[PDB]
Every structure is written in C-alpha cells, then in structure tokens.
Amino acid sequence: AGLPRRIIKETQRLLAEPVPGIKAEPDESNARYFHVVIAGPQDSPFEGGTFKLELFLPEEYPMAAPKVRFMTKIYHPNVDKLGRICLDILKDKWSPALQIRTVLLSIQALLSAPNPDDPLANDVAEQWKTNEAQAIETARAWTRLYAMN
Amino acid sequence: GVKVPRNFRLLEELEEGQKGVGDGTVSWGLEDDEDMTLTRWTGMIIGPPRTNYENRIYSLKVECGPKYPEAPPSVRFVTKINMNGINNSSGMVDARSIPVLAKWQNSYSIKVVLQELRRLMMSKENMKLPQPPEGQTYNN
Ligand SMILES: *c1ccc([N+](=O)[O-])o1
C-alpha cells in the first residue's frame, strides 16, 4: 500500500547517514518531498552560509530523476533567480543507478565549482567570466544577505 | 495518490505558461521574476468575440497561497470589468460565484481558472453587460 522499498531505504539511510554538510528531512505531509539544507562548501564564497533546497521524488522514481530547486537566493552562474539548476545528472545523464545522495553532493560540488562556461548558465555568467573577483565578492555579499539566518 | 508539492506544481505551471496553450487567448506568468515563492502571477484573457468584452485585453492578478493547488488561488481583475461574480468596485473574483473556484479540485490550475473566466464572458448573463471604458483599471 506504501512506498517502494527503494524509497523507504534511501530515506532511512539519509537520516542514518547524512552527507557531511547536508541536512535532509522528509516533509510532514508528503513522504516524497524533502527539505534540504546545504552548507556553503569550505573555501567557497558561500562558506558559512546555509542554503535551502527542496527535493521531490516523482511517481516514476527512480526511472525518472528527482526534482530539485534552491529556495534561498544565491549568486551563482548555474542557479537562476528562482533557484532552478540544469544539472546533467538530473536530465540527460539520469539513471536509476544514481541515487538521491549522488544528486545532493553533486549540487554541493556545483556550489564549490561554479561553471559560467556552461551553455545554459544564467545571466550572472558574464560577470563571473570577465570579472571573477567581483563576481565572487557578490556571491559572498548575497551569502551575508540571504544565507546567514 | 502521489501529490506533487505546491512549489513543483507551480514550476510546471511556469513552464507551461512560457510555452503557451491553445490559441493564446489566455496567458499567465510570474509577476515578479525573482519571486522564489512563485506566489504572485499575472493572468491575461482576451475578451471573446461577439460579446461586450471583445477586442479587450484583461489583466488579472492571481495569488497562489500556501495551500495551492489543494485550495484555489485568489483572483482579481486589474482591468475594469462588469461581469457576474466580479466585484465591480474592486475587481475581486468571488470564489462562491465562479464554479471552477467554488468547486475547486486539485487537478485545476491557473490556466483552467483563466479559461473558465473567458468561457463565462460568453454566458448569456455577461456578454451583453455594458462595460466601463477601455483600459481603465481598479485602484490598489
Ligand atoms: C538551468 C536552469 C537554471 C540554470 N542556470 O544556470 O541558472 O540552468
């Protein structure tokens, strides 16, 4: 009557063995919906900040990829104004062998290594390419403004 | 009975709004392109032909609150309109008077609401109402 074993397993293993720097807790009404907090990675302009991310396991999971979005404003060439990302492994490169966990530490890696070179980077990319020092300071400024409480 | 959470539903509606539907006589999009909460939307309805709404573009504000889509959105016309179920002084759409809202189901969407309002503009009791001057908007 319930969830697939895989989902029961992935959930339970998340609460038993969290990714370092990532808190992930299921929603109080929807067992396929998770409220995630990612710590800004060490040595990034996001360091010291905490960033909300939401994750949803659609009906066809794991055939279908999980859906994710940031819900804390962040200055990054691969996260847009509404928190959306275009992560290869969430589309073209998704497969059932990958797990939720792969997705989360991969998002942390994206924060650690912004890619303004990506075809689908947002409009922040130009500043990141041409004045990287200023772009990184702005990322730190937005961390101070939006990610410290 | 897998429910798609509010925020992911609204992301779907954002994509659909950008793609557009049907003949383009209704459209919707986010009011503030930095609103991560996806709460405030702009709706558009082209008044249907052979009614007193014809050849007018109606702008609306649609608010998807914390319980959407389990609960209906709140809707108000910005463009002035004389239409049953719409408060003619404020533009507020009375949920009890518009069937899609009064009988809301979680399968409905912003698109459905706007399509319903456009259908109701063709109703016998609305299509002949004399309208306010074109282009006028309510205050607030
Ligand atoms: C895909 C969705 C948003 C982005 N981005 O780079 O901001 O990519």
DSSP letters, A42-60, are TTSTTTT-EEEEEEE--TT
When divided into structural domains, chain B yields a total of 1
**Are the Cβ atoms of A32 and B2 closer than 8 angstroms?**
yes
Is the CB of A75 inside a 6 Å radius of any atom of ligand 1?
no
Exp. method: X-ray
- Under a CB-based contact definition with an 8 Å cutoff, are residues B138 and B90 in contact? yes
**What's the one-letter identity of residue B61?**
K
**Please, how many CA atoms are within 13 Å of residue B50, restricted to the half-sphere of its CB?**
4
In 3D, which of A77, A67, A71 has the Cα closest to residue A51? A71
Catalytic residue among A7, A86, A98, A136: A86
Query: Residue B68: which domain range?
Result: 1-140
**Please, how many CA atoms are within 13 Å of residue A51, restricted to the half-sphere of its CB?**
30
The alpha-helical segments, DSSP class H, found in B5-75 are 6-19
The DSSP bridge pattern shows strands B57-63 and B74-77 to be antiparallel
In chain A, the residue whose alpha carbon lies closest to the alpha carbon of B34 is: A81
**Interface check B35 vs A, CB under 8 A:** yes
Resolution (angstroms) equals 1.4
In 3D, which of A94, A74, A96 has the Cα closest to residue A84? A74
As its CATH architecture, domain A1-149 has Roll (3.10)
Domain boundaries, chain A: 1-149
CATH number at residue B37: 3.10.110.10
What is the rounded CA–CA span in Å between residue B16 and residue B29?
Answer: 9
Residue matched to tokens 């300071």: A137
The alpha-helical segments, DSSP class H, found in A17-148 are 100-112, 125-130, 132-146
**Are the Cβ atoms of B7 and A54 closer than 8 angstroms?**
yes
Residues in chain B: 140
What is the rounded CA–CA span in Å between residue B102 and residue A55?
Answer: 32
